[PDB]
């Protein structure tokens, strides 16, 4: 049958994975290739109904956010719940200074440039094929 | 096999693949090509998102975006073509009113600049206002200053960067100057071209001849002599057409009784009465006093139809008992009987206009020494010649004063070109000739024949009545005639130009001893400026080195008629011999490019281009040789003119005449007219403010295109018809020349001897194969 | 070296030589245009 | 009547077989060529009745489950049948702990990825030919 | 539209970057390849509405001017208004002499030649692709 009509690809999530690739080359990410392959497989799986596809994406957005959190070296949420008393005690200016020290504007600019490049290249190159190929290669290397 | 895909693949995808394979197979693709095509297509689908709307829009206009790739017919290495074309699309380029208006207004302002400058110099009319000694001194210092500055710019040594900057600046100056019209612009461009050419020649003579290896020395000397001869010819041509006279007609006295007697001559030998009827009718239609013009037909065949036609219409008819010296002898024999003070001579095909003699003979009644006056056959060379009193007879459409013509014993008969020799003889006795570029009115085989006879006639004119050692000629006329003779001799320089790149590539000589870039920085300015200045002088709409390639290939073709004077050859051995040398030179050059030292590598590349140029030029000469004998169409001039048609019903149909001939007319009628064949209709033709009604019968109707035929007309009706119809008051080129050379080589492979037929066929095959990958817009 | 002196002086200035050449072209064109107008008047009449 | 018309392939069982291959390549399962090939032939037998088809699926599903259990290293079905009373009597928390320890989440992730891969490849290439070819090649290798 | 023909190119800004490339060859630039790439992405961002396109270009003009200020060795603002008092104290003739000494008219002639070449090429060849390729080349060289 025409099951290809239900294989819509990752679409915007491509940029998502592409971002991670950069943070992999930049060393900012603790990569879990199997979880990335699981997420790609779940977002690629064909759901016959359009509403089901939309609901899957809406459910997967929090899951993708949690996976991205797990892929970085940032402190876990429980640490934030424990130290919220210390966080709130600091002044607003202190928090502004700390975050400005944290925000690496080069990575923000790289994100912007990569977003533009992805929007231009989605016309000519199948980004989903390449993203899945890179994920498979990374899993192969991390296994053998 | 269908079994393999059937077992391996699911039936839907198997069916789609089989459908694609069969679709490729039906369109003439082999099985291997078809399988490769399906492989490439599935790769394209897996990599490139061909379902995206952008790619749908790419696919829908595939034919326009990929003209040389057949979508329905795969062929191996098609992905190479796809990649090349996609790279070209990536590289090539795909408030408008304000920018366009500003730009156009800028050219228009620059174009009207000469008029404003002339007006401003008119109000300060003014050297000219100083004493003779003061004028001489001021002009002398002015000329010496200008010439010393020009010499300094001629003899100035530069490095590549300074040289390139100088060339760019001079090229830009020439480009700005060309846009502005006027004779001052022409003179400025001429001076620029002279300066650049002198710089090039100075560099070649001072820095490029190799004095170490004698073979390279000899080759360089021959090539430099050829370049010097070409430069001399170019300078002489510049001088000939430096200042066209642009002569205007001086009106005849208003009293018609003071007008002279003219005898019109129409000499014919084999032309049909259809051709000569138009000429004689239009001659009878010329505005002139009847008692002051007499028409003569000089038929060498004694055709009785001509006699009856002349007697019915009244024009004089005279035949010859003997036929020595051809047309010149015929005119000389007829001249014993004419009694007018002027003799006009017309070719059979040339139609005389009514306003001919009135516009022409004012100069005759004004200037006493004017023994000749010439009107254009269809240029700018004659206008320049008239400045130097060197306008020569072209055999027709000219008026000669009778007394000077009889002084030299009639038309010269010692040369094939009796016209030019008669002009020479008129000039040698101290008489003047004129030329008016005012309209008064084919097959390229006749063009080549007439060029051949012109060359031979100039050869014999030099042989018998040598202008250089002759008496009675001013310097400018000698320069004009010598320039014509030189231009008819340009075969040896072209042979040297063809052979020299082989003198480098085969013998490994250094005919021109200089770095390749230096070569490009002294030579390309020369041809660029020469072409630009010649384009300005001629004023042609199409103007480029490509156009110049065109006359070089149509002048290399008459190399051996002119050389013998002192179709057949282009296929003979001594020609394909040269082509084969130019061809093996290319392979040897590829060998030098890969296997020779890198230090000389660029030089080899240069010779490549040179040889390529030769390969085009030779390929041109064969091509015309077969296209000369291929033209089949006849006289058909399509011009728009509002005629009228009235039916038997009297319904007035204004129409436009598409084509016309003595047999009838084919016209375009505006609107829907139910005109039936055989219906007697009235055709109203417009001659100025007069309207003449000719009754016609409709013979053919193609929709709005209606053909009408004439019932037996009368003498006055015939004259009116000829007056209203004939005696009226009336990067791409590089590609075209490439096609011309390619078609010449293809014909050479078709018609050469077999032993070289095979080689030329193979060469054409790989040339087409190589061109098959070229990107296209 | 009297003539190598000027070449050394103007060697590094293609702009100046271009301007001088343009001036010489315009000037010589003016004198030639005057002469040719004189000859044209002498021949037309 | 006509037989060959019923050779639709293993269909769903194909995935199951590939799953076993994964556990065979990961070394966590002890593959039995005889019983597995017998099960494949039993599911591949062209039965003209649709009722026989559904009845065979109904019979094979518990048989397939028992075969999968037997191919593992867990205690045999008779032993677990005898010990079911104690197993139900055991604490829920320790049972959950044992279940979590037994379940390697890497295997579940790989199985999800292979499910998606099978669903994708079930539209281009007939997986039946390759699955049966791998089974036969494994048998040939075991013979040598 | 849906196929996003809103990739209109850099147009005039092309010459802008070309100039910088020339000035990168002349050594007068403290080049910032990342900011140039971000600026190129911002200018190349596909915006459907023409009003927002014009608004984007109009805000980009001062941003481009400030970026050119930053990429040159000419001094930052603080030095500019620190020496503005001395410039005001200097005579007009001194300012004119400093102006005449500051301009290197050879680079002005080269810039004009580049302008003519850019106009001709944009008449014949899309230069936006070449400019973008050179920008990524500079970024790749700087990164590695």
Report the 3 state secondary structure along chain A.
Answer: CCHHHHCCCCCCHHHHHHHHHHHHHCCCECCCHHHHHHHHHHHHCCCCCHHHHHHHHHHHHHHHHHHHHHHECCCCHHHHHHHHHHHHHCCHHHHHHHHHHHCCHHHHHHHHHHHHHHHHHCCCCCHHHHHHHHHHHHHHHHHC
CB contact under 8 A, B8 and D129: yes
Residues 6+ apart with CB under 8 A from B85: B65, B66, B68, B69, B775, B776
Alpha-carbon distance values, B553 to B523, B583, B619, B736 (Å): 20, 18, 9, 13
- Please state whether at least 3 CB pairs lie below 8 Å between chains B and D: yes
Tell me the C-alpha distance between E17 and E114, whole Å: 11
From B78, B347, B419, B720, active-site residue? B419
Give dist(CA A128, CA A124) in Å, integer.
Answer: 12
Distances (CA, A) of B43 to B49, B236, D119: 11, 65, 21
Closest residue of chain B to C27, computed from CA coordinates? B146
Q: Do C29 and B389 touch (CB under 8 A)?
A: no
Task: Assess contact for A96 and E25: CB atoms under 8 A.
Answer: no
Spatial neighbors of B543 by CB under 8 A, at least 6 apart, are B531, B534, B535
Instruction: Please report the number of interchain residue pairs, chain A to chain B, with beta-carbon separation below 8 angstroms.
Output: 19
For residue B17, give the nearest of E60, E103, B8, A122 by alpha carbon.
Answer: B8
Interface list for chain B against chain E, based on CB atoms closer than 8 Å: 52-54, 56-57, 90-94
| Per-residue burial over A100-111, b = 16 or more CB atoms within 10 Å of its CB, e = otherwise | eeeeeeeeebbe
Angle at D135 between CA D130 and CA D141, to 5 degrees: 120
Closest of B399, B338, B393, B388 to residue B365, by C-alpha = B399
Contacts of range B629-633, beta carbons closer than 8 Å, 24 or more positions apart: B629/B445, B629/B567, B631/B443, B631/B444, B631/B445
CB contact under 8 Å between A1 and B12, yes or no, is yes
Burial class (CB in 10 A: 0-12, 13-18, 19+), D34: exposed
User: What is B642-725's CATH number?
Assistant: 2.40.10.220
Structure tokens at B744: 């010449």
Q: Which residues on chain B are in Cβ contact (under 8 Å) with E124?
A: 93
The C-alpha of B611 sits at a distance from chain D's nearest C-alpha, in angstroms, of 56
Q: For chain D, what's the residue count?
A: 144
Structural domain boundaries enclosing D22: 4-143
Shortest distance, CA D53 to any CA of chain A (angstroms)? 22
Q: Which CATH superfamily is domain B260-475 in?
A: Spore Coat Polysaccharide Biosynthesis Protein SpsA; Chain A (3.90.550.10)
CB contact under 8 A, A124 and B49: yes
In a domain, E2, yes or no: no
Chain A residues whose beta carbon lies within 8 Å of the beta carbon of residue E46? 119
Residue B351 near residue B209, CB atoms below 8 Å:
no
The pair of structure tokens assigned to E1 is 């539209």
What is the Cα–Cα distance from B571 to B498, expressed in whole angstroms?
Answer: 17
Pairwise CB contact (< 8 Å): A113 & E35: no
> Chain D: nearest CA to A114, how far in angstroms?
28
Chain D residue whose CA is closest to B13: D124
d(CA B459, CA B466): 10
Question: Can you read off the two tokens belonging to residue B328?
Answer: 């010149």
Q: What is the DSSP letter of B260?
A: -
The answer to whether the beta carbons of residues E31 and E72 sit under 8 Å apart is: no
Helix (H) or strand (E) holding B686: strand B680-687
- Which among B42, B39, B21, B41 has a CA at the least distance from the CA of B31? B21
Please answer whether residues D129 and B8 qualify as being in contact, where contact means their C-beta atoms are separated by less than 8 angstroms.
Answer: yes
CB neighbours of D123 closer than 8 A, spacing ≥ 6? A3, A4, B10, B13
Q: Treating both helix axes as pointing N-terminal to C-terminal, what angle do B96-123 and B160-179 enclose, rounded to 10 degrees?
A: 80
> Do the domain assignments include residue E85?
yes
Query: How many angstroms separate the CA atoms of E5 and E24, rounded?
Result: 32
Is there a contact between B84 and B66 (Cβ–Cβ < 8 Å)? no
B419 is catalytic: yes
Return the percent helix, strand and coil in chain D, to nearest 5.
75, 0, 25
A116 chain-E contacts, CB cut-off 8 A: 41, 44-45
- Mutation target to probe the B interface, by most B beta carbons within 10 A, among E1, E2, E3, E122 is E3
- Chain E nearest C-alpha distance from B90 (Å): 7
Chain C's closest residue to B127, CA to CA, is: C34
Contacts of A38 in chain D (CB under 8 A): 109, 112-113
**Contact: A113, E7; criterion CB under 8 Å:** no
Is there a contact between A125 and B55 if contact means CB atoms under 8 Å apart? no
CB B458 within 8 A of CB B420: yes
Outline where DSSP puts E strands in B396-512: 398-401, 432-435
| Closest C-alpha among E70, E58, E51, E71 to residue E12 | E58
Which bin fits D40, alpha (ψ -120 to 50), beta or left (φ > 0)? alpha
Half-sphere exposure in the Cβ direction for A44 (13 Å, CA): 24
Identify the CA nearest to E138 among candidates E12, E38, E32: E32
Burial class of D111 by CB neighbour count within 10 A (0 to 12, 13 to 18, 19+): middle
Reported as type and span, the H/E element at residue B653 is: strand B652-661
Other CB atoms within a 10 A radius of the CB of residue D84 amount to 10
Q: Which chains touch D (3 or more CB pairs under 8 A)?
A: A, B
Between chains, do B243 and C43 touch, taking CB under 8 Å as contact?
Answer: no
The experimental technique used to determine this model is cryo-EM
Chain B hits for C13, CB-CB cut-off 8 Å, are: 162
Burial class (CB in 10 A: 0-12, 13-18, 19+), B293: buried
Are A122 and B52 within 8 A, CB to CB? yes
Under a CB-based contact definition with an 8 Å cutoff, are residues B199 and B524 in contact? no
- How many domains, in total, are found in chain C? 1
- Strand B342-345: give its sheet, edge to edge: B316-318, B293-299, B262-268, B342-345, B398-401, B370-374, B432-435
Angle at D105 between CA A28 and CA D109, to 5 degrees: 75
Experimental resolution (Å): 3.4
What is the distance between the alpha carbons of residues B164 and E107, in angstroms, rounded to a whole number?
Answer: 17
Asked if B614 and B579 count as a contact pair (C-beta separation under 8 A), the reply is: no
In Å, how far are B106, B179, E118 from B103, measured between CA atoms?
A: 5, 13, 17
Chains E and D touch (3+ CB pairs under 8 A): no
* Residue B669 bridge partners (DSSP): B655
Dist. CA B728–CA B739, nearest whole Å: 38
| Whether the Cβ atoms of residue B431 and residue B369 lie closer than 8 Å to each other | yes
- Asked if C34 and B145 come within 8 Å (Cβ–Cβ), the reply is no
Token pair in block for residue B92 = 């090539």
Dist. CA E48–CA E38, nearest whole Å: 20
**Residues 6 or more apart whose Cβ sits within 8 Å of residue B656:** B640, B641, B642, B643, B667, B668, B669, B670
Q: Which residues of C touch B162 (CB under 8 A)?
A: 11-14
Rounded distance, CA B357 to CA B344, Å? Answer: 9
Give me the number of domains chain D comprises.
1
Per-position b or e across D4-29, b if 16+ CB within 10 A of its CB? eeeeebbeebbbbbbbbbbbbeeeeb
Cβ-contact C36, B184 below 8 angstroms: no
User: How far, in whole angstroms, is CA E88 from its chain's centroid?
Assistant: 29
Chains A and E: 3 or more CB pairs within 8 Å of each other: yes
Nearest chain B alpha carbon to C45: B367
Does any domain span residue E20? yes
């Amino acid at each position: 049958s025409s099951l290809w009509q239900y294989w819509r690809g990752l679409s915007g999530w491509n940029f998502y994975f592409l971002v991670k690739f950069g943070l992999l080359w930049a060393g900012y990410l603790n990569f879990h290739p199997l979880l990335n392959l699981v997420f790609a497989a779940f977002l690629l799986m064909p759901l016959p109904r359009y509403s089901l596809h939309r609901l899957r994406h809406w459910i997967a957005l929090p899951i993708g956010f949690a996976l991205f959190w797990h892929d970085t070296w940032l402190p876990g949420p429980e640490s934030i719940m424990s130290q919220g008393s210390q966080v709130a005690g600091f002044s607003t200016d202190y928090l502004i200074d700390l975050v400005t020290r944290f925000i690496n504007w080069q990575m923000i600019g790289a994100i912007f440039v990569l977003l533009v490049a992805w929007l231009f290249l989605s016309q000519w190159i199948r980004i989903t094929v390449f993203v899945v190929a890179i994920l498979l290669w990374l899993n192969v290397l991390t296994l053998a | 096999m269908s079994i393999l895909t059937r077992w391996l693949l699911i039936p839907p995808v198997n069916a789609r693949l089989i459908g694609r394979y069969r679709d490729y197979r039906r369109h003439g693709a082999s099985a291997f090509s078809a399988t490769l095509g399906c492989f490439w297509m599935i790769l394209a689908w897996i990599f490139i998102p061909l379902e995206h709307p952008r790619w749908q829009r790419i696919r829908a206009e595939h034919k326009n975006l990929y003209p040389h790739i057949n979508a329905s017919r795969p062929r191996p290495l098609d992905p190479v073509r796809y990649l090349i074309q996609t790279c070209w699309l990536l590289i090539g380029a795909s408030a408008f009113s304000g920018l366009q208006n500003i730009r156009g207004r800028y050219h228009q302002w620059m174009n009207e600049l000469p008029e404003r400058v002339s007006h401003k110099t008119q109000h300060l009319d003014e050297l000219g206002h100083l004493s003779a000694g003061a004028r001489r001194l001021i002009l002398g210092i002015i000329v010496t200053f200008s010439l010393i500055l020009a010499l300094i710019c001629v003899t100035q040594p530069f490095n590549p960067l300074a040289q390139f900057i100088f060339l760019m600046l001079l090229w830009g100056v020439a480009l700005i100057v060309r846009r502005m019209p006027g004779r001052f612009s022409a003179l400025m461009l001429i001076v620029l071209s002279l300066t650049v050419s002198c710089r090039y020649i100075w560099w070649r003579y001072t820095s490029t001849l190799n004095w170490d290896d004698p073979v390279s020395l000899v080759c360089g000397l021959i090539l430099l002599f050829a370049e010097t001869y070409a430069w001399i010819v170019l300078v002489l041509g510049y001088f000939q057409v430096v200042w066209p006279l642009n002569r205007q007609p001086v009106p005849l006295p208003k009293d018609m009784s003071l007008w002279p007697s003219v005898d019109i001559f129409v000499p014919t030998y084999n032309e049909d009465l259809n051709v000569v009827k138009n000429t004689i009718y239009a001659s009878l239609g010329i505005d002139w006093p009847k008692d002051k013009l007499n028409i003569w037909i000089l038929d060498d065949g004694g055709r009785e139809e001509f006699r009856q036609f002349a007697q019915n219409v009244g024009v004089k008819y005279i035949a010859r008992t003997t036929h020595e010296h051809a047309k010149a002898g015929n005119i000389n024999n007829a001249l014993k009987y004419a009694k007018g003070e002027f003799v006009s001579i017309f070719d059979c095909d040339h139609v005389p206009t009514r306003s001919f003699l009135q516009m022409t003979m004012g100069w005759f009644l004004k200037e006493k020494q004017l023994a000749m006056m010439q009107t254009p056959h269809h240029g700018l060379v004659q206008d320049g010649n008239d400045m130097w009193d060197a306008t020569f007879f072209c055999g027709s459409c000219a008026v000669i004063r009778r007394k000077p013509l009889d002084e030299i014993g009639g038309i010269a008969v010692e040369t094939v070109t009796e016209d030019a020799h008669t002009s020479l003889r008129l000039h040698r006795r101290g008489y003047t000739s004129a030329y008016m570029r005012i309209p008064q009115a084919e097959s390229l085989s006749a063009h080549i024949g007439q060029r051949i006879r012109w060359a031979r006639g100039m050869v014999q004119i030099f042989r018998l009545d040598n202008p250089l050692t002759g008496k009675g000629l001013k310097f400018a006329q000698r320069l004009c005639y010598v320039n014509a003779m030189f231009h008819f001799l340009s075969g040896i320089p072209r042979l040297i130009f063809l052979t020299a790149p082989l003198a480098f590539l085969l013998l490994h000589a250094y005919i021109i001893y200089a770095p390749a870039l230096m070569i490009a920085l002294f030579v390309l300015p020369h041809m660029i400026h020469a072409s630009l200045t010649n384009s300005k002088i001629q004023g042609k709409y199409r103007h480029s080195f490509w156009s110049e390639i065109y006359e070089t290939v149509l002048a290399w073709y008459i190399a051996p008629p002119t050389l013998v004077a002192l179709v057949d050859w282009v296929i003979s051995r001594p020609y394909i011999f040269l082509v084969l040398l130019n061809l093996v030179g290319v392979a040897v050059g590829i060998w030098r490019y890969f296997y020779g030292p890198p230090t000389e590598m660029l030089t080899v590349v240069v010779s490549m281009v040179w040889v390529f140029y030769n390969l085009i030029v030779l390929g041109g000469a064969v091509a015309v040789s077969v296209e000369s004998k291929q033209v089949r169409r006849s006289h058909r001039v399509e011009m728009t003119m509002p005629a009228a048609i009235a039916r038997e019903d009297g319904h007035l149909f204004s129409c436009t005449v598409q084509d016309f001939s003595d047999g009838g007319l084919g016209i375009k009628i505006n609107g829907q007219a139910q005109i039936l064949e055989g219906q007697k209709v009235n055709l109203l033709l417009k001659r100025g403010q007069q309207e003449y009604v000719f009754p016609t019968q409709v013979a053919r109707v193609m929709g709005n295109e209606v053909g009408l035929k004439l019932m037996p007309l009368t003498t006055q009706q015939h004259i009116d018809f000829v007056q209203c119809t004939f005696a009226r008051a009336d990067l791409e080129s590089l590609l075209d020349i490439l096609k011309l050379g390619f078609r010449g080589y293809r014909h050479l492979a078709e018609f050469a001897p077999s032993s070289v037929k095979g080689i030329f066929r193979v060469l054409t095959s790989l040339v087409s194969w190589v061109v098959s990958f070229i990107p296209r817009r | 070296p009297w003539f190598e002196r000027l070449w050394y002086a103007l060697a590094n200035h293609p702009i100046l030589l271009a301007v001088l050449a343009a001036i010489s072209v315009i000037l010589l064109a003016w004198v030639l245009w005057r002469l040719l107008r004189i000859i044209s008047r002498r021949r037309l009449n």
